[PDB]
């Protein structure tokens, strides 16, 4: 059964990105657009992605369906934070990398909307 | 371990006899006041949904209060609650516990007291 540490070490070897691991074993890295993504695991069971979006953005309806797992836009210290979670069990390297990629793409879109489906389905 | 199998395990525990095919949404009747829909997306994601019946004060919607989180969405100008997790690893005991937490939360959010807006969420946040 793969631990969070093993997973994240394998992932960062794969990605070749500059990153930090704090002394609470939270992984952090930053990419262009001043986007810092944090990955943390609770109780060796739940993996979270998190990013402070740096502004108080328009309140998102926060439905499920647009992303799997969902990307939820919350509010902390008067500013928007985006987060997404899923269980560690069954989480694999290809899933982590794809999840990170779509989470970052979502962040970029939300932080800069003025770039160049109305219906959600089960 | 499929959604069907998990649901049949829930019916066995509830004493129900009902057919729920892989793509079906099941309406879990809690109260003449509460229904929880249970669905599974792409044979992978178990999804809970309930209408809260008011346009509630915006929820800060942070993770941490329940695992998996209960997220307050807005749909047709009213508040909904939802929660999800992956089917892999999920078993009947966790499925029941999850449902109990979700139902408890719904009942609390439908009380007159949380009609009133809450204090702003502020860091540090410690998740023990
Ligand atoms: Cl990446
Ligand atoms: Cl109410």
Name the 3-class secondary structure at A51: strand
Q: Reduced to 3 states, what is the DSSP secondary structure of residue A112?
A: coil
Residue partners of A20: CB distance under 8 A and separation at least 6: A27, A28, A29
CB neighbour list of residue A30: distance below 8 Å, 6 or more residues apart:
A36, A37
The candidate with the shortest Cα–Cα distance to B101, out of B93, B112, B113, is B93
Instruction: Count other C-beta atoms under 10 Å from residue B123's C-beta.
Output: 10
Experimentally, the structure was elucidated by X-ray
- Taking CA atoms, A97 is separated from A5, A8, A21, B19, B88, in Å, by 15, 10, 17, 37, 19
Quote the DSSP letter at residue A66: S
Tell me how many domains chain A contains: 1
Interchain proximity A43–B67, CB inside 8 Å? yes
Residue range(s) defining the domain that contains residue A93: 1-122
Task: Provide the resolution (angstroms).
Answer: 1.8
- Cα–Cα separations (whole angstroms), residue B126 to A34, A52, B25: 25, 17, 36
Nearest to A100 by CA among A36, A56, A20, A4: A36
Q: Which two tokens stand for residue B17?
A: 């006899």
Residue in B45, B68, B90 nearest the CB of A85: B68
Q: Which of B6, B93, B96 is nearest to B45 (CA)?
A: B6
Mutate to test the interface with A, among B23, B63, B80 (most CBs of A within 10 A): B63
Question: Does the bond joining B124 to the residue before it have cis omega, within 30 degrees of 0?
Answer: yes
Half-sphere exposure of B52 (CA within 13 A, CB side): 30
CA distance A75 to chain B (A): 5
* Strands A79-87, B34-41: pairing kind: unpaired
Beta strands in chain A (DSSP E): 20-21, 27-31, 35-42, 46-52, 72-76, 79-87
Per-residue 3-state assignment (H helix, E strand, C coil) for chain B: CCHHHHHHHHHHHHCCCCCCCCCCCEEEEEECCEEEEEEEECCCEEEEEEECCCCCCCCCCCCCCCCCCCEEEEECCEEEEEEEEECCCCCHHHHHHHHHHHHHHHHHHCCHHHHCCCCCCCCCCCCC
Task: Give me the CATH number covering residue B60.
Answer: 3.30.1460.10
Alpha carbon distance A108, A102 (integer Å): 10
Alpha carbon distance B1, A89 (integer Å): 14
């Amino acid at each position: 059964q793969t631990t969070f540490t093993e997973l994240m070490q394998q992932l960062f070897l794969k990605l070749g990105l500059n990153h930090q691991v704090n002394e609470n074993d939270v992984y952090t890295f930053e990419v262009d657009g001043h986007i810092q993504v944090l990955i943390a695991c609770y109780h060796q069971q739940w993996v979270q992605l998190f990013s402070e979006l740096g502004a108080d953005l328009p309140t998102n309806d926060n439905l499920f369906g647009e992303h799997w797992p969902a990307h939820v836009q919350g509010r902390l210290d008067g500013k928007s934070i985006l987060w997404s979670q899923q269980s560690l069990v069954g989480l694999d390297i290809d899933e982590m990398q794809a999840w990170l990629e779509r989470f970052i793409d979502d962040i970029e879109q939300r932080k800069e909307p003025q770039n160049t489906s109305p219906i959600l389905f089960i």
